[PDB]
Amino acid sequence: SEKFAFQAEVNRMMKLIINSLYKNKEIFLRELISNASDALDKIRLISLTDENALAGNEELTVKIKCDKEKNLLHVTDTGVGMTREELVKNLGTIAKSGTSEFLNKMTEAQEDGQSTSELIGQFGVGFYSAFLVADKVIVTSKHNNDTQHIWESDSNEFSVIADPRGNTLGRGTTITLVLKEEASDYLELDTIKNLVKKYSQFINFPIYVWSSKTETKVEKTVWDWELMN
Numbered sequence: 188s189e190k191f192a193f194q195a196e197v198n199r200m201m202k203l204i205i206n207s208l209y210k211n212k213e214i215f216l217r218e219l220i221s222n223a224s225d226a227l228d229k230i231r232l233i234s235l236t237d238e239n240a241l242a243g244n245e246e247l248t249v250k251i252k253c254d255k256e257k258n259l260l261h262v263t264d265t266g267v268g269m270t271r272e273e274l275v276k277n278l279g280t281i282a283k284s285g286t287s288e289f290l291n292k293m294t295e296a297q298e299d300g301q302s303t304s305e306l307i308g309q310f311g312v313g314f315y316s317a318f319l320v321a322d323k324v325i326v327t328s329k330h331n332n333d334t335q336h337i338w339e340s341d342s343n344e345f346s347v348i349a350d351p352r353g354n355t356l357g358r359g360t361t362i363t364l365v366l367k368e369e370a371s372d373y374l375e376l377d378t379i380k381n382l383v384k385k386y387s388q389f390i391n392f393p394i395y396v397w398s399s400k401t402e403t404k405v406e407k408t409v410w411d412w413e414l415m416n
């Protein structure tokens with residue numbers, strides 16, 4: 188449907204982030220998990236004021252799935268979600284007041300030889316680190332005040348469409364990563380489980396990985412959400 192170019196500062200930001208974490212690519216998952224935590228924190232706080240805030244989906248979880256066969260990684264939360272306008276502005280521009288400070292602090296850091304990965308985490312701009320391991324990033328989101336929408340980008344542009352599938356999330360957001368060939372190891376359950384456990388121990392919400400256990404030629408395989416924190 189509707190196509191957009193990234194704001195120039197976001198193009199600059201993306202490159203800064205990519206270069207900062209280029210040799211620590213796994214950090215992308217830490218940031219997606221941190222963002223999902225923030226979104227969950229937000230709807231939890233809204234529920235203090237809105238008696239019907241959780242009506243679209245009564246759960247408060249992060250859920251992560253590998254799809255080796257389709258080369259996809261999904262990170263789904265039932266947090267606050269994003270309206271169409273929010274997908275466009277939050278992901279495509281320097282929206283928040285603090286974000287603009289990131290760019291300056293990031294540059295002053297890289298000159299003074301200070302660590303920068305803490306800056307990415309502190310300012311919550313880690314979403315773009317997804318492009319370290321993904322050729323395409325897809326964001327499906329449902330907010331109580333809007334219909335379900337899909338944002339998609341290969342980092343050279345982005346587009347937003349209303350989801351033709353309707354409201355499948357209930358409430359929350361899915362980050363779908365179309366993984367680079369070099370990043371296929373993030374499709375392995377053992378790798379993902381190890382990373383999710385490392386980055387979710389400090390999160391105040393339950394995080395699940397869609398895992399499998401095979402028995403016993405005759406084989407029996409059991410699929411279900413394995414709690415990681």
Ligand SMILES: Nc1ncnc2c1ncn2[C@@H]1O[C@H](C(=O)NCCO)[C@@H](O)[C@H]1O
Pocket residue numbers: 222223226264266267268269277278286311312313314315360
């Ligand atoms: N899972 C997520 N759920 C709800 N909102 C999310 C989200 N992941 C990112 N966002 C929103 O997009 C913004 C964002 O990550 N912009 C890119 C860096 O500035 C976040 O500040 C947040 O407001």
